mmCIF file of C-alpha atoms and ligand atoms in Angstrom:
data_model
loop_
_atom_site.group_PDB
_atom_site.id
_atom_site.type_symbol
_atom_site.label_atom_id
_atom_site.label_comp_id
_atom_site.label_asym_id
_atom_site.label_seq_id
_atom_site.Cartn_x
_atom_site.Cartn_y
_atom_site.Cartn_z
ATOM 1 C CA UNK D 24 -29.267 25.705 7.246
ATOM 2 C CA UNK D 25 -25.883 25.931 9.146
ATOM 3 C CA UNK D 26 -23.185 23.649 7.411
ATOM 4 C CA UNK D 27 -20.970 22.998 10.451
ATOM 5 C CA UNK D 28 -17.141 22.571 9.035
ATOM 6 C CA UNK D 29 -15.139 22.979 11.871
ATOM 7 C CA UNK D 30 -12.941 20.335 12.665
ATOM 8 C CA UNK D 31 -10.768 20.497 16.064
ATOM 9 C CA UNK D 32 -7.446 18.997 15.317
ATOM 10 C CA UNK D 33 -6.714 17.571 18.836
ATOM 11 C CA UNK D 34 -3.367 15.412 18.433
ATOM 12 C CA UNK D 35 -1.005 14.325 15.747
ATOM 13 C CA UNK D 36 -0.933 10.453 15.204
ATOM 14 C CA UNK D 37 1.430 10.704 12.240
ATOM 15 C CA UNK D 38 3.890 12.902 10.520
ATOM 16 C CA UNK D 39 5.931 11.851 7.251
ATOM 17 C CA UNK D 40 6.942 12.969 3.968
ATOM 18 C CA UNK D 41 2.972 12.486 3.181
ATOM 19 C CA UNK D 42 2.357 15.492 5.517
ATOM 20 C CA UNK D 43 0.427 14.751 9.018
ATOM 21 C CA UNK D 44 -2.491 12.687 10.427
ATOM 22 C CA UNK D 45 -4.519 14.158 13.083
ATOM 23 C CA UNK D 46 -7.366 12.804 15.285
ATOM 24 C CA UNK D 47 -9.916 15.508 15.183
ATOM 25 C CA UNK D 48 -13.052 15.891 16.646
ATOM 26 C CA UNK D 49 -16.328 16.893 14.140
ATOM 27 C CA UNK D 50 -19.985 17.381 16.319
ATOM 28 C CA UNK D 51 -18.211 15.265 19.324
ATOM 29 C CA UNK D 52 -17.119 12.574 16.826
ATOM 30 C CA UNK D 53 -13.454 11.306 15.978
ATOM 31 C CA UNK D 54 -12.506 11.752 12.651
ATOM 32 C CA UNK D 55 -8.830 11.287 11.088
ATOM 33 C CA UNK D 56 -7.508 14.187 9.127
ATOM 34 C CA UNK D 57 -4.522 13.912 6.692
ATOM 35 C CA UNK D 58 -3.100 17.187 5.943
ATOM 36 C CA UNK D 59 -1.017 16.670 2.519
ATOM 37 C CA UNK D 60 2.588 18.099 2.133
ATOM 38 C CA UNK D 61 3.487 19.821 -1.385
ATOM 39 C CA UNK D 62 5.394 16.633 -1.866
ATOM 40 C CA UNK D 63 2.143 14.408 -1.930
ATOM 41 C CA UNK D 64 -0.513 16.760 -3.622
ATOM 42 C CA UNK D 65 -0.896 14.633 -6.275
ATOM 43 C CA UNK D 66 -2.013 11.637 -3.795
ATOM 44 C CA UNK D 67 -4.910 13.964 -2.682
ATOM 45 C CA UNK D 68 -6.148 14.652 -6.249
ATOM 46 C CA UNK D 69 -6.006 10.836 -6.965
ATOM 47 C CA UNK D 70 -7.978 9.699 -4.142
ATOM 48 C CA UNK D 71 -10.446 12.564 -4.560
ATOM 49 C CA UNK D 72 -10.947 11.470 -8.305
ATOM 50 C CA UNK D 73 -11.275 8.024 -7.355
ATOM 51 C CA UNK D 74 -14.021 8.939 -4.468
ATOM 52 C CA UNK D 75 -15.814 11.085 -6.834
ATOM 53 C CA UNK D 76 -16.069 8.463 -9.530
ATOM 54 C CA UNK D 77 -17.239 5.738 -6.882
ATOM 55 C CA UNK D 78 -18.203 6.090 -3.402
ATOM 56 C CA UNK D 79 -16.605 3.084 -1.943
ATOM 57 C CA UNK D 80 -18.272 1.780 1.206
ATOM 58 C CA UNK D 81 -17.163 -1.592 2.668
ATOM 59 C CA UNK D 82 -16.143 -2.551 6.510
ATOM 60 C CA UNK D 83 -12.587 -3.362 5.516
ATOM 61 C CA UNK D 84 -11.941 -0.090 3.266
ATOM 62 C CA UNK D 85 -11.082 2.886 5.347
ATOM 63 C CA UNK D 86 -14.410 4.762 5.481
ATOM 64 C CA UNK D 87 -14.396 8.052 3.501
ATOM 65 C CA UNK D 88 -15.954 11.481 5.067
ATOM 66 C CA UNK D 89 -14.556 14.445 3.023
ATOM 67 C CA UNK D 90 -12.108 15.958 1.012
ATOM 68 C CA UNK D 91 -11.528 19.531 1.748
ATOM 69 C CA UNK D 92 -9.355 22.210 -0.386
ATOM 70 C CA UNK D 93 -8.829 25.548 1.492
ATOM 71 C CA UNK D 94 -7.646 28.651 -0.060
ATOM 72 C CA UNK D 95 -4.526 30.237 1.660
ATOM 73 C CA UNK D 96 -2.796 33.662 1.231
ATOM 74 C CA UNK D 97 0.144 31.757 -0.630
ATOM 75 C CA UNK D 98 -0.769 28.302 -0.492
ATOM 76 C CA UNK D 99 -3.700 25.500 -1.177
ATOM 77 C CA UNK D 100 -4.427 23.242 1.946
ATOM 78 C CA UNK D 101 -5.403 19.871 1.150
ATOM 79 C CA UNK D 102 -7.156 17.472 3.813
ATOM 80 C CA UNK D 103 -8.402 14.002 3.471
ATOM 81 C CA UNK D 104 -10.874 13.083 6.461
ATOM 82 C CA UNK D 105 -11.710 9.660 7.213
ATOM 83 C CA UNK D 106 -13.156 7.241 9.796
ATOM 84 C CA UNK D 107 -10.690 7.277 13.016
ATOM 85 C CA UNK D 108 -9.110 3.818 14.023
ATOM 86 C CA UNK D 109 -7.954 4.424 17.478
ATOM 87 C CA UNK D 110 -6.128 1.175 17.717
ATOM 88 C CA UNK D 111 -3.771 2.596 14.734
ATOM 89 C CA UNK D 112 -2.088 0.921 11.838
ATOM 90 C CA UNK D 113 -1.468 -3.088 11.740
ATOM 91 C CA UNK D 114 2.244 -2.224 11.471
ATOM 92 C CA UNK D 115 2.088 -0.513 15.008
ATOM 93 C CA UNK D 116 -0.128 -2.954 16.307
ATOM 94 C CA UNK D 117 2.072 -6.161 15.389
ATOM 95 C CA UNK D 118 5.240 -4.230 17.141
ATOM 96 C CA UNK D 119 4.012 -5.129 20.750
ATOM 97 C CA UNK D 120 1.028 -7.585 20.064
ATOM 98 C CA UNK D 121 1.019 -11.308 19.598
ATOM 99 C CA UNK D 122 -2.061 -13.449 18.082
ATOM 100 C CA UNK D 123 -3.970 -16.421 18.525
ATOM 101 C CA UNK D 124 -5.227 -18.655 15.811
ATOM 102 C CA UNK D 125 -8.810 -16.981 15.700
ATOM 103 C CA UNK D 126 -7.199 -13.370 15.653
ATOM 104 C CA UNK D 127 -4.441 -13.812 13.023
ATOM 105 C CA UNK D 128 -7.118 -15.383 10.666
ATOM 106 C CA UNK D 129 -9.683 -12.775 11.339
ATOM 107 C CA UNK D 130 -6.843 -10.119 10.604
ATOM 108 C CA UNK D 131 -5.736 -11.554 7.343
ATOM 109 C CA UNK D 132 -9.256 -12.866 5.962
ATOM 110 C CA UNK D 133 -10.594 -9.159 6.891
ATOM 111 C CA UNK D 134 -7.494 -7.616 4.459
ATOM 112 C CA UNK D 135 -8.371 -10.204 1.783
ATOM 113 C CA UNK D 136 -11.989 -9.083 1.851
ATOM 114 C CA UNK D 137 -10.917 -5.475 1.595
ATOM 115 C CA UNK D 138 -8.582 -6.027 -1.405
ATOM 116 C CA UNK D 139 -11.052 -8.383 -3.459
ATOM 117 C CA UNK D 140 -13.535 -5.531 -3.060
ATOM 118 C CA UNK D 141 -11.110 -3.248 -4.604
ATOM 119 C CA UNK D 142 -9.995 -5.491 -7.109
ATOM 120 C CA UNK D 143 -13.511 -6.732 -8.191
ATOM 121 C CA UNK D 144 -15.535 -4.771 -11.155
ATOM 122 C CA UNK D 145 -19.355 -4.575 -10.054
ATOM 123 C CA UNK D 146 -21.790 -3.608 -13.091
ATOM 124 C CA UNK D 147 -25.041 -1.577 -12.951
ATOM 125 C CA UNK D 148 -21.484 -1.054 -9.087
ATOM 126 C CA UNK D 149 -17.864 0.158 -9.124
ATOM 127 C CA UNK D 150 -14.755 -0.040 -11.374
ATOM 128 C CA UNK D 151 -12.032 -2.603 -10.569
ATOM 129 C CA UNK D 152 -9.420 -0.747 -8.514
ATOM 130 C CA UNK D 153 -5.757 -1.622 -7.964
ATOM 131 C CA UNK D 154 -4.221 0.070 -4.513
ATOM 132 C CA UNK D 155 -0.265 -0.096 -5.900
ATOM 133 C CA UNK D 156 1.260 0.494 -2.131
ATOM 134 C CA UNK D 157 -0.410 -2.231 0.051
ATOM 135 C CA UNK D 158 1.620 -2.582 3.573
ATOM 136 C CA UNK D 159 1.008 -3.051 7.027
ATOM 137 C CA UNK D 160 1.367 0.880 7.814
ATOM 138 C CA UNK D 161 -1.548 1.251 5.377
ATOM 139 C CA UNK D 162 -3.651 -1.283 7.215
ATOM 140 C CA UNK D 163 -5.776 -0.014 10.246
ATOM 141 C CA UNK D 164 -7.147 -2.548 13.143
ATOM 142 C CA UNK D 165 -10.437 -1.751 14.276
ATOM 143 C CA UNK D 166 -11.837 -2.609 17.743
ATOM 144 C CA UNK D 167 -13.886 -5.579 16.343
ATOM 145 C CA UNK D 168 -10.498 -7.727 15.211
ATOM 146 C CA UNK D 169 -11.131 -6.728 11.559
ATOM 147 C CA UNK D 170 -8.853 -4.342 9.703
ATOM 148 C CA UNK D 171 -9.313 -1.811 6.762
ATOM 149 C CA UNK D 172 -7.241 -0.835 3.979
ATOM 150 C CA UNK D 173 -6.086 2.722 3.812
ATOM 151 C CA UNK D 174 -4.848 5.321 1.408
ATOM 152 C CA UNK D 175 -5.944 4.975 -2.079
ATOM 153 C CA UNK D 176 -3.719 7.888 -3.070
ATOM 154 C CA UNK D 177 -1.570 5.903 -5.789
ATOM 155 C CA UNK D 178 -4.848 3.659 -6.817
ATOM 156 C CA UNK D 179 -5.719 2.989 -10.347
ATOM 157 C CA UNK D 180 -9.205 2.260 -11.873
ATOM 158 C CA UNK D 181 -10.311 0.103 -14.675
ATOM 159 C CA UNK D 182 4.738 8.835 -6.220
ATOM 160 C CA UNK D 183 5.649 5.186 -6.760
ATOM 161 C CA UNK D 184 5.200 2.008 -4.429
ATOM 162 C CA UNK D 185 6.979 1.561 -1.394
ATOM 163 C CA UNK D 186 10.138 -0.184 -2.584
ATOM 164 C CA UNK D 187 10.273 -2.923 0.197
ATOM 165 C CA UNK D 188 6.965 -4.236 -1.174
ATOM 166 C CA UNK D 189 7.564 -4.112 -4.654
ATOM 167 C CA UNK D 190 6.970 -6.949 -6.911
ATOM 168 C CA UNK D 191 9.589 -8.461 -9.135
ATOM 169 C CA UNK D 192 8.230 -7.174 -12.166
ATOM 170 C CA UNK D 193 8.276 -3.953 -10.837
ATOM 171 C CA UNK D 194 11.832 -3.909 -9.943
ATOM 172 C CA UNK D 195 13.130 -5.534 -13.428
ATOM 173 C CA UNK D 196 10.397 -3.135 -15.603
ATOM 174 C CA UNK D 197 8.702 -6.077 -17.064
ATOM 175 C CA UNK D 198 5.432 -5.325 -15.836
ATOM 176 C CA UNK D 199 2.652 -5.259 -18.374
ATOM 177 C CA UNK D 200 1.834 -1.794 -17.846
ATOM 178 C CA UNK D 201 -1.138 -1.600 -20.384
ATOM 179 C CA UNK D 202 -2.844 -4.646 -18.741
ATOM 180 C CA UNK D 203 -4.956 -3.787 -15.602
ATOM 181 C CA UNK D 204 -4.532 -7.198 -14.209
ATOM 182 C CA UNK D 205 -0.724 -6.643 -14.009
ATOM 183 C CA UNK D 206 -1.757 -4.312 -11.086
ATOM 184 C CA UNK D 207 -3.876 -6.557 -9.213
ATOM 185 C CA UNK D 208 -0.986 -9.229 -9.389
ATOM 186 C CA UNK D 209 1.442 -6.674 -7.519
ATOM 187 C CA UNK D 210 -0.992 -5.904 -4.957
ATOM 188 C CA UNK D 211 -1.316 -10.005 -4.510
ATOM 189 C CA UNK D 212 2.549 -9.954 -4.251
ATOM 190 C CA UNK D 213 2.533 -7.281 -1.449
ATOM 191 C CA UNK D 214 -0.673 -9.112 0.050
ATOM 192 C CA UNK D 215 1.524 -12.151 0.463
ATOM 193 C CA UNK D 216 4.379 -10.055 2.326
ATOM 194 C CA UNK D 217 1.736 -8.625 4.669
ATOM 195 C CA UNK D 218 0.489 -12.074 5.402
ATOM 196 C CA UNK D 219 4.054 -13.305 6.456
ATOM 197 C CA UNK D 220 4.306 -10.174 8.867
ATOM 198 C CA UNK D 221 1.095 -11.019 10.540
ATOM 199 C CA UNK D 222 1.828 -14.868 10.618
ATOM 200 C CA UNK D 223 5.108 -14.316 12.181
ATOM 201 C CA UNK D 224 3.478 -12.811 15.233
ATOM 202 C CA UNK D 225 0.769 -15.757 15.654
ATOM 203 C CA UNK D 226 1.718 -18.026 18.887
ATOM 204 C CA UNK D 227 2.333 -21.751 18.183
ATOM 205 C CA UNK D 228 3.505 -24.155 20.965
ATOM 206 C CA UNK D 229 4.456 -21.462 23.028
ATOM 207 C CA UNK D 230 6.653 -19.838 20.336
ATOM 208 C CA UNK D 231 6.063 -16.567 18.367
ATOM 209 C CA UNK D 232 8.760 -14.454 16.227
ATOM 210 C CA UNK D 233 9.522 -10.991 16.789
ATOM 211 C CA UNK D 234 7.996 -8.318 14.588
ATOM 212 C CA UNK D 235 10.218 -7.669 11.462
ATOM 213 C CA UNK D 236 9.542 -6.082 8.006
ATOM 214 C CA UNK D 237 9.637 -8.167 4.835
ATOM 215 C CA UNK D 238 13.404 -8.686 3.896
ATOM 216 C CA UNK D 239 14.625 -7.375 6.915
ATOM 217 C CA UNK D 240 17.533 -9.873 6.989
ATOM 218 C CA UNK D 241 18.870 -9.369 3.487
ATOM 219 C CA UNK D 242 18.294 -5.334 2.724
ATOM 220 C CA UNK D 243 19.261 -2.297 4.437
ATOM 221 C CA UNK D 244 16.995 -0.244 6.841
ATOM 222 C CA UNK D 245 16.094 1.864 3.891
ATOM 223 C CA UNK D 246 16.528 -0.127 0.936
ATOM 224 C CA UNK D 247 17.462 1.185 -2.442
ATOM 225 C CA UNK D 248 15.433 0.066 -5.639
ATOM 226 C CA UNK D 249 18.799 -1.724 -6.620
ATOM 227 C CA UNK D 250 18.902 -3.384 -3.262
ATOM 228 C CA UNK D 251 15.461 -4.893 -3.632
ATOM 229 C CA UNK D 252 15.930 -5.611 -7.441
ATOM 230 C CA UNK D 253 19.006 -7.904 -6.441
ATOM 231 C CA UNK D 254 17.269 -9.883 -3.715
ATOM 232 C CA UNK D 255 13.913 -10.337 -5.343
ATOM 233 C CA UNK D 256 14.860 -10.314 -9.254
ATOM 234 C CA UNK D 257 18.513 -11.429 -9.330
ATOM 235 C CA UNK D 258 18.835 -13.988 -6.308
ATOM 236 C CA UNK D 259 14.975 -14.968 -6.183
ATOM 237 C CA UNK D 260 14.943 -14.623 -2.555
ATOM 238 C CA UNK D 261 11.760 -15.067 -0.637
ATOM 239 C CA UNK D 262 10.793 -14.118 3.078
ATOM 240 C CA UNK D 263 12.356 -17.176 5.420
ATOM 241 C CA UNK D 264 9.387 -19.551 6.683
ATOM 242 C CA UNK D 265 10.443 -20.916 10.276
ATOM 243 C CA UNK D 266 10.410 -24.421 11.164
ATOM 244 C CA UNK D 267 8.093 -23.947 13.877
ATOM 245 C CA UNK D 268 5.144 -23.022 11.403
ATOM 246 C CA UNK D 269 5.331 -26.991 10.219
ATOM 247 C CA UNK D 270 4.096 -27.908 13.655
ATOM 248 C CA UNK D 271 0.799 -25.580 13.406
ATOM 249 C CA UNK D 272 -2.146 -26.515 10.730
ATOM 250 C CA UNK D 273 -2.865 -22.928 10.562
ATOM 251 C CA UNK D 274 0.187 -21.603 9.849
ATOM 252 C CA UNK D 275 1.458 -24.633 7.726
ATOM 253 C CA UNK D 276 -1.736 -23.334 5.367
ATOM 254 C CA UNK D 277 -0.657 -19.674 5.691
ATOM 255 C CA UNK D 278 2.839 -20.746 4.573
ATOM 256 C CA UNK D 279 1.347 -22.546 1.601
ATOM 257 C CA UNK D 280 -0.881 -19.464 0.570
ATOM 258 C CA UNK D 281 1.931 -16.705 0.769
ATOM 259 C CA UNK D 282 4.227 -18.875 -1.353
ATOM 260 C CA UNK D 283 1.325 -18.796 -4.049
ATOM 261 C CA UNK D 284 1.322 -14.915 -3.882
ATOM 262 C CA UNK D 285 5.144 -14.522 -4.386
ATOM 263 C CA UNK D 286 5.481 -16.515 -7.789
ATOM 264 C CA UNK D 287 7.862 -14.796 -10.200
ATOM 265 C CA UNK D 288 5.184 -15.436 -12.929
ATOM 266 C CA UNK D 289 2.650 -12.822 -12.056
ATOM 267 C CA UNK D 290 0.041 -14.900 -13.863
ATOM 268 C CA UNK D 291 0.775 -17.929 -11.467
ATOM 269 C CA UNK D 292 -0.315 -15.885 -8.369
ATOM 270 C CA UNK D 293 -3.553 -16.510 -6.574
ATOM 271 C CA UNK D 294 -6.329 -14.024 -6.954
ATOM 272 C CA UNK D 295 -8.053 -12.002 -4.173
ATOM 273 C CA UNK D 296 -11.110 -13.997 -4.555
ATOM 274 C CA UNK D 297 -9.120 -17.354 -4.281
ATOM 275 C CA UNK D 298 -7.282 -16.319 -1.142
ATOM 276 C CA UNK D 299 -10.587 -15.516 0.545
ATOM 277 C CA UNK D 300 -11.599 -19.098 -0.196
ATOM 278 C CA UNK D 301 -8.699 -20.619 1.030
ATOM 279 C CA UNK D 302 -8.784 -18.566 4.295
ATOM 280 C CA UNK D 303 -12.650 -19.735 4.882
ATOM 281 C CA UNK D 304 -11.534 -23.403 4.820
ATOM 282 C CA UNK D 305 -8.454 -22.978 7.279
ATOM 283 C CA UNK D 306 -9.417 -24.244 10.774
HETATM 284 C C1 LU8 H 422 -18.834 21.769 2.896
HETATM 285 O O1 LU8 H 422 -17.913 21.096 3.946
HETATM 286 C C2 LU8 H 422 -18.034 20.309 4.797
HETATM 287 C C3 LU8 H 422 -19.743 19.947 5.144
HETATM 288 C C4 LU8 H 422 -20.031 18.990 6.261
HETATM 289 C C5 LU8 H 422 -21.575 18.993 6.176
HETATM 290 C C6 LU8 H 422 -21.756 19.738 7.280
HETATM 291 N N1 LU8 H 422 -23.225 19.630 7.807
HETATM 292 C C7 LU8 H 422 -23.997 19.227 6.624
HETATM 293 C C8 LU8 H 422 -23.844 18.871 5.303
HETATM 294 C C9 LU8 H 422 -24.777 18.370 4.492
HETATM 295 C C10 LU8 H 422 -24.914 17.032 3.855
HETATM 296 C C11 LU8 H 422 -25.755 17.080 3.093
HETATM 297 C C12 LU8 H 422 -26.795 17.812 2.647
HETATM 298 C C13 LU8 H 422 -27.881 17.481 1.903
HETATM 299 C C14 LU8 H 422 -29.178 17.612 2.239
HETATM 300 C C15 LU8 H 422 -30.308 17.109 1.073
HETATM 301 N N2 LU8 H 422 -29.350 16.827 -0.147
HETATM 302 C C16 LU8 H 422 -30.618 16.288 -1.135
HETATM 303 C C17 LU8 H 422 -28.845 17.912 -0.515
HETATM 304 C C18 LU8 H 422 -27.665 18.294 0.361
HETATM 305 C C19 LU8 H 422 -26.894 19.119 3.417
HETATM 306 C C20 LU8 H 422 -25.748 19.387 4.192
HETATM 307 C C21 LU8 H 422 -22.466 18.459 5.089
HETATM 308 C C22 LU8 H 422 -21.667 17.993 4.149
HETATM 309 C C23 LU8 H 422 -18.994 18.535 6.820
HETATM 310 C C24 LU8 H 422 -17.551 18.793 6.735
HETATM 311 O O2 LU8 H 422 -16.945 18.273 7.251
HETATM 312 C C25 LU8 H 422 -16.930 17.188 8.121
HETATM 313 C C26 LU8 H 422 -17.367 19.824 5.289
HETATM 314 O O3 LU8 H 422 -16.061 20.006 5.226
HETATM 315 C C27 LU8 H 422 -15.186 19.052 4.657
HETATM 316 C C1 LU8 H 423 -19.836 14.199 5.444
HETATM 317 O O1 LU8 H 423 -20.058 13.368 6.869
HETATM 318 C C2 LU8 H 423 -21.104 13.238 7.456
HETATM 319 C C3 LU8 H 423 -22.124 14.058 7.195
HETATM 320 C C4 LU8 H 423 -23.457 13.804 8.117
HETATM 321 C C5 LU8 H 423 -24.377 14.591 7.280
HETATM 322 C C6 LU8 H 423 -24.865 16.188 8.034
HETATM 323 N N1 LU8 H 423 -26.140 16.562 7.713
HETATM 324 C C7 LU8 H 423 -26.851 15.971 6.888
HETATM 325 C C8 LU8 H 423 -26.665 14.787 6.023
HETATM 326 C C9 LU8 H 423 -27.627 14.118 4.875
HETATM 327 C C10 LU8 H 423 -28.838 14.112 5.022
HETATM 328 C C11 LU8 H 423 -29.719 13.794 4.104
HETATM 329 C C12 LU8 H 423 -29.434 13.303 2.849
HETATM 330 C C13 LU8 H 423 -30.410 12.832 1.618
HETATM 331 C C14 LU8 H 423 -31.285 11.963 2.333
HETATM 332 C C15 LU8 H 423 -32.156 11.399 1.247
HETATM 333 N N2 LU8 H 423 -32.451 12.122 0.027
HETATM 334 C C16 LU8 H 423 -33.581 13.113 0.258
HETATM 335 C C17 LU8 H 423 -31.481 13.088 -0.300
HETATM 336 C C18 LU8 H 423 -30.614 13.887 0.646
HETATM 337 C C19 LU8 H 423 -27.940 13.207 2.971
HETATM 338 C C20 LU8 H 423 -27.056 13.734 3.733
HETATM 339 C C21 LU8 H 423 -25.560 14.220 6.486
HETATM 340 C C22 LU8 H 423 -25.429 12.700 6.120
HETATM 341 C C23 LU8 H 423 -23.211 13.389 9.281
HETATM 342 C C24 LU8 H 423 -22.087 12.971 9.630
HETATM 343 O O2 LU8 H 423 -21.845 12.164 10.483
HETATM 344 C C25 LU8 H 423 -23.441 11.797 11.317
HETATM 345 C C26 LU8 H 423 -21.319 12.914 8.597
HETATM 346 O O3 LU8 H 423 -20.206 12.101 9.102
HETATM 347 C C27 LU8 H 423 -19.041 12.473 9.651
HETATM 348 C C1 LU8 H 424 -2.637 4.918 6.616
HETATM 349 O O1 LU8 H 424 -3.409 6.126 6.166
HETATM 350 C C2 LU8 H 424 -3.989 6.660 6.856
HETATM 351 C C3 LU8 H 424 -4.400 6.331 8.270
HETATM 352 C C4 LU8 H 424 -5.305 7.375 8.927
HETATM 353 C C5 LU8 H 424 -5.745 6.984 10.531
HETATM 354 C C6 LU8 H 424 -6.739 6.788 10.720
HETATM 355 N N1 LU8 H 424 -7.176 6.309 11.715
HETATM 356 C C7 LU8 H 424 -6.392 6.555 13.053
HETATM 357 C C8 LU8 H 424 -5.016 6.532 12.688
HETATM 358 C C9 LU8 H 424 -3.951 6.598 14.060
HETATM 359 C C10 LU8 H 424 -4.510 6.729 15.234
HETATM 360 C C11 LU8 H 424 -3.776 6.768 16.248
HETATM 361 C C12 LU8 H 424 -2.651 6.055 16.285
HETATM 362 C C13 LU8 H 424 -1.728 6.068 17.414
HETATM 363 C C14 LU8 H 424 -1.789 7.134 18.581
HETATM 364 C C15 LU8 H 424 -1.672 6.676 19.925
HETATM 365 N N2 LU8 H 424 -1.337 5.433 20.296
HETATM 366 C C16 LU8 H 424 0.064 5.491 21.086
HETATM 367 C C17 LU8 H 424 -1.004 4.334 19.189
HETATM 368 C C18 LU8 H 424 -1.782 4.720 17.978
HETATM 369 C C19 LU8 H 424 -2.056 6.076 15.050
HETATM 370 C C20 LU8 H 424 -2.950 5.927 13.939
HETATM 371 C C21 LU8 H 424 -4.692 6.802 11.354
HETATM 372 C C22 LU8 H 424 -3.466 7.294 11.222
HETATM 373 C C23 LU8 H 424 -6.065 8.185 8.508
HETATM 374 C C24 LU8 H 424 -5.775 8.387 6.988
HETATM 375 O O2 LU8 H 424 -6.460 9.727 6.320
HETATM 376 C C25 LU8 H 424 -7.033 10.440 6.922
HETATM 377 C C26 LU8 H 424 -4.766 7.598 6.467
HETATM 378 O O3 LU8 H 424 -4.436 8.193 5.039
HETATM 379 C C27 LU8 H 424 -5.214 7.445 3.873
#
């Protein structure tokens, strides 16, 4: 039998320190091809090891297709092939797009659903998984209005995270590194930041905030570890909740939720399953 492995690389949709992402075509179908830099080879190994352990399949997790290693003359080429989401990342999408109540809730409940699926151990199943780099650039928007979580290159089963999204216990180095639940609680902090980014773009009473990344008003464009530690740990700042949210029942409920993801005490933060339940009772 013929094993068709040719993928036609059609357009670069992402370039960074990680390497590149391409829209590709296999057998008439769009796929996404991440070509890893030498900088980021260990992310390919980690994600490949995870998918060799558990074949995750969930509507809110970017769908795996393949891990490919090809011998070249003087290098190894590493590709991760996934489902392709033409609308791109949530970060991208929020720059131009504003949301109504239904779309806002559908986006955030879909992210919570993906995250709870990662976090939960299923017996008989999957190991519990923490993501460790959750952020709006690592979430893709699907045409049905739900999102999916991407990039398990730092994930842990039971490279550092993006500094802007690091929880206080990561920044002050008090994280309980021998406790898997510690890593779930770091993801919940990051989830609360993403929830803030999305809620800002939800229209109420003809008002919306411009897209901004978390802590845009208190750290530099490319913040240092120290910049983040001073804001989050020493001064204990949290993202601003605009007054206009408190006129809108959905944004009032989302402000409460994001506060309960941002407690200094990691064990006080809501779990992903509790966030889902709260979101199903809003509106
Ligand atoms: C190696 O490399 C790539 C392969 C493919 C690909 C292409 N045609 C067919 C296949 C296939 C799947 C499964 C079987 C089964 C059938 C019965 N079963 C009990 C034993 C084996 C056979 C063949 C694959 C996996 C795509 C690729 O890219 C999208 C590949 O490169 C990453
Ligand atoms: C990697 O990804 C893609 C792969 C394929 C693909 C191509 N040839 C054959 C297969 C296949 C056939 C049969 C079995 C099983 C059936 C039951 N039992 C007897 C064990 C064997 C497994 C696998 C597939 C899945 C198609 C795809 O898209 C249409 C893929 O997605 C891009
Ligand atoms: C976060 O991480 C990964 C993401 C992806 C991925 C999957 N579907 C689609 C995309 C994409 C497509 C299109 C655009 C643009 C192009 C045109 N328009 C003007 C705006 C939109 C952006 C993004 C990506 C980047 C794949 C990955 O691995 C293969 C990723 O890494 C795990």
